[PDB]
Design a binder for this molecule. Structure first.
Ligand SMILES: [Mg+2]
Ligand SMILES: [Mg+2]
Ligand SMILES: [Mg+2]
Lengths: 65, 99, 117, 106, 88
RNA sequence: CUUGAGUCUCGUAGAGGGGGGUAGAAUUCCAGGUGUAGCGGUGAAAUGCGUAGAGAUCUGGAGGAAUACCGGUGGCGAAGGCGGCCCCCUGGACGAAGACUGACGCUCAGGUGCGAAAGCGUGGGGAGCAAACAGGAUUAGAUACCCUGGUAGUCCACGCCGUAAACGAUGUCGACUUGGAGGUUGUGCCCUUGAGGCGUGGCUUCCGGAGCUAACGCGUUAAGUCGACCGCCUGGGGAGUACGGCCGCAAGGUUAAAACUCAAAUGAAUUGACGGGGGC
């Protein structure tokens, strides 16, 4: 439902933890655009971005760690 | 085939799909299946599932229909999970596990 | 001997087997309950009722150190696991939280073939 | 030289050399046509997940149009050296000199 | 693959002018340079058959051009073949 | 001659490829700690396995293997196919815009490659898994299925091998002809403008008209209309066989008979019966 387009970012800087946290569950699983209604490329950009931030320790693989 | 024997194997498969593969969970809980009652030839499976939803038909009803509404989709799931030509008809029952 | 007062137990909510253990707050698990160990075997060890009754074996160790709080974990989706949690609430020990921590991998381990009719 | 955005952390405890090693690293940048288009440090920040049983790692960032080789020895250095505790190196389409979500909080 | 700058250097001499970009010569020269860049990749990466697939797509291409040129003016062909040091 | 063809410049997405890194779970092992009486197995046991203290828990390590969510008609590809993150190398696609070249084309026998898994070779490597084989649970054919183990294999590197229902069971290219709903990814315009309104490309999907089809259906991503080239078949069984060649180290593949035999083989649909089914 065109919310990333409202933000206006064709390329999403991955360092945006606040947006990433909304797209991340308490477990840390990525919510799909089925419910978030985000377009695929951003969906694509976010999934790769979450892993790299997770590698940098910005995002938790899972709280249990 | 032999229903009382295949029941143990099917219950494990039913639990795995129920817990990790849900996106319309009115239960929103770890609902646990007490038992299953497959017919001869496994044509019909009766799944008796208890609800971690405070054991009140109010919350339980939300899921049992949710259990029934997504059956064809979940049918595929269990239907492509034990190489079964019989995809069991799915039925759901809150169990009075507590009396 | 030494009081802990902050209960922390580990259960193994497997299908064919049902076993709880008592743990110290800093790991160091101390004492345990095996429903199979009660003499229940086969279907009887797996019965949800056996898991519910196994509370007394867990309770006696908890009573020896007199621990009260409840921070316990569930690993494995055992049949009627919620009923076992109800039995722990029926006991009336103060409950702080229960953790649904069935371990999920990334598919790294190779699974073994499923059994067939 | 080509664009990059680079971030790593040094063990928080070894922060004595953290201010100098940066430019001591940019010795490569400053000494091999390194056009550092931006650099950021954030300081000790609690790790979301512990790495090597460590917490509050010393966060730092770099933005350079750098040649193919310099980055290599630069990261092998990190691969070589041990004060650093984890590393990362990613190419960027263009140079980024805008407040980053870490600093933009300030 | 290439650098636009190398393509511009080839276009300036092989082409009559910078705009002259379709001339068979200006075409085969670019293909030959591309093959040389791919050959360096294959020296350590023999496994990368997938990239070899394109490699074929061009050696044959000029091969068609050569003929098309050769059947058009051997004059340029004759010099081209030796200009590009090919078919020696 | 320039629209076919192709180049340049501008981008643009993509599990494309090759290499090298690297992460986190998981599993096993090992370390400890605390902590035991079991444990796991079945329908039940057996089988396994525990006071050496197992089983459980944390803490640690080692190893190998694979990359959850995302993630799906979603892409990438000639196809087989491609699924953690990073970097190096590299193929192709596409849009826009303009120029350049000027028929530079298509198909392809022969040809040369490409190539799922298992398999062969050498040396590797060894989590987990699992043919073979092994212990307990047997007689309608138990020769068992089930559990307990388990080597090769499964991974690597280099080799061979060259087949799979390698399947859209639909050769390649080009042109022509009603719709609608999607997806995807371009990009123009016009709205501030998201959204919105006009577009306009690419690719993909589901209906579906006409048309075609034995029927089934197909249906602008035609099985409609056409064109060009290639490939193939001629009742069924014997039979993709004997044998000969070729290839392969083998395994083996490839090539491909004939003898004899028969009145059908066989496709789609249709109507019913039954049942070891279930709803009302
Ligand atoms: Mg293999
Ligand atoms: Mg075949
Ligand atoms: Mg296939």
């Amino acid at each position: 439902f065109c919310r990333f387009t409202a933000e206006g970012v064709q390329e999403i800087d991955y360092k945006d933890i606040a947006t990433l946290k909304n797209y991340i569950t308490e477990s840390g699983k990525i919510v799909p655009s089925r419910i978030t209604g985000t377009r695929a490329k951003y969906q694509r950009q976010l999934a790769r971005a979450i892993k790299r931030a997770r590698y940098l320790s910005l995002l938790p693989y899972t709280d249990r760690h | 085939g032999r229903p009382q024997r295949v029941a143990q194997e099917m219950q494990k498969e039913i639990a795995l799909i129920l817990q990790r593969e849900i996106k319309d969970p009115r239960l929103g809980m770890m609902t646990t299946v007490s038992g299953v009652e497959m017919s001869r030839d496994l044509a019909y499976a009766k799944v008796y599932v208890t609800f971690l939803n405070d054991k009140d038909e109010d919350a339980v009803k939300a899921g049992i229909k949710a259990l029934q509404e997504a059956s064809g989709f979940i049918r595929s799931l269990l239907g492509k999970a034990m190489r079964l030509r019989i995809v069991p008809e799915l039925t759901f029952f809150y169990d009075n596990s507590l009396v | 001997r030494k009081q802990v007062s902050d209960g922390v137990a580990h259960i193994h909510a497997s299908f064919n087997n049902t076993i709880v253990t008592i743990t110290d707050r800093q790991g160091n698990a101390l004492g345990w309950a095996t429903a199979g160990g009660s003499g229940f075997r086969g279907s009887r060890k797996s019965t949800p009722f056996a898991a519910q009754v196994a509370a007394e074996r867990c309770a006696d160790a908890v009573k020896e150190y007199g621990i009260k709080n409840l921070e316990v974990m569930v690993k494995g989706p055992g049949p009627g696991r919620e009923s076992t949690i109800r039995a722990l609430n029926a006991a009336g020990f103060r409950i702080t939280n229960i953790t649904d921590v069935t371990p999920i991998p990334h598919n790294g381990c190779r699974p073994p073939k499923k059994r067939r009719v | 030289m080509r664009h990059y955005e680079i971030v790593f952390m040094v063990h928080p405890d070894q922060s004595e050399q953290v201010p100098g090693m940066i430019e001591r690293y940019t010795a490569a940048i400053t000494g091999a046509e390194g056009k550092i288009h931006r650099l950021e440090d954030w300081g000790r920040r609690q790790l979301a997940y512990p790495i090597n049983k460590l917490h509050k790692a010393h966060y730092v960032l770099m933005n350079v149009e750098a040649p193919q080789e310099v980055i290599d020895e630069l990261e092998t250095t990190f691969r070589f050296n041990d004060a650093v505790i984890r590393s990362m190196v990613m190419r960027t389409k263009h140079a980024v000199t805008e407040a980053s979500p870490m600093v933009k909080a300030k | 693959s290439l650098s636009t700058e190398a393509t511009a250097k080839i276009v300036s001499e092989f082409g009559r002018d910078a705009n002259d970009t379709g001339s068979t010569e200006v075409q085969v020269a670019l293909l030959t340079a591309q093959i040389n860049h791919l050959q360096g990749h294959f020296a350590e990466h023999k496994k990368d058959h997938h990239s070899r697939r394109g490699l074929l797509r061009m050696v044959s291409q000029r091969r068609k051009l050569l003929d098309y040129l050769k059947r058009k003016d051997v004059a340029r062909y004759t010099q081209l073949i030796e200009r590009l040091g090919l078919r020696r």
